């Protein structure tokens, strides 16, 4: 998979950053075997204020992680995975969990090229 | 939804930014019911020159608005809130509305979590 | 199309910008008729060490292209798309394959509007 982070600009100190990236990929192999190979955790930096919510600016402790996944997984299984998310997220970035937003796209695995596949 | 919205640096200033989230906001809202809970706006700011148009590098102007939607609307409503987005956020970014771009994508709505959603 | 070309801050010179556009854009056109309208190459700079890989810091090297495709492609087609971004960026961006991911996301034409469309 490849998880897109999007996080205020130094909410999270290069600690705070690996114990994020370390909640969510463990995650995502929690919930899946084998077949999985490698987990990308791509953080994507703004300052604090690029967050509207209802049209109203916020102060900087959202997160939204954009999951890009392969087709084929259950509904149940992907809302474990979003919860597990949530939770273990809320921890390594010291947020309540309502700041947290969670969406999962998915793609045939075809079309899903890491570290030069197919 | 999730509108992710890539601008360049420094174009919109504070009030334009919060123009620009009203008329995303607003063009949302305007075209669903009671049903909708929460639009996010996400400003993605680059360096202007991070834009190259059939391999041209562009000059900053450019917004790509990037939503992120539950499935079922038909295609008739998706084209009139892309319609309204353009060119709502003409004004708002006092940009001309060949500077925008608009793509949705569309996901089922059970693995999209707000806020601590489902 | 929108490629989303995710790289760590100062990895591209100017010219490799060009370069990796160049590389991206031309690598869709060859592989595509004149139903072919326009490539966006939208590049996302963050500090180096903000990619993880398995939990693991990445030194600044790696490139994420997210392409945002129309639906209707073959899998061999995009397979092929998939391959030349991969050689063609390798070079341009002086990185070795392996540095390299790309995932194709792709949406009903109607959704995808550009520089004003449908």
């Known amino acids: 998979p490849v998880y897109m982070v999007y996080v205020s600009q130094d909410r999270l100190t ?6 994020v990236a370390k909640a969510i990929t463990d995650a995502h192999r929690g919930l899946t075997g084998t077949q999985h190979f490698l987990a990308q955790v791509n953080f994507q930096e703004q300052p604090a204020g690029n967050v509207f919510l209802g049209g109203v600016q916020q102060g900087g402790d959202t997160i939204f992680v954009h999951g890009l996944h392969r087709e084929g997984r259950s509904a149940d299984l992907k809302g474990q995975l979003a ?20 969406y999962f796209g998915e793609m045939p695995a075809q079309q899903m090229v890491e570290y030069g596949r197919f």
Chains 1, 2, 3 share one sequence.
Do not use: L, M, N
């Not at 919860?83 to 969990?97: K, T």
């Open 14 to 19: 290069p600690s705070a950053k690996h114990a």
């Open 83 to 102: 919860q597990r998310i949530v939770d273990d997220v809320s921890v390594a970035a010291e947020i309540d969990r309502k700041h947290i937003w969670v």
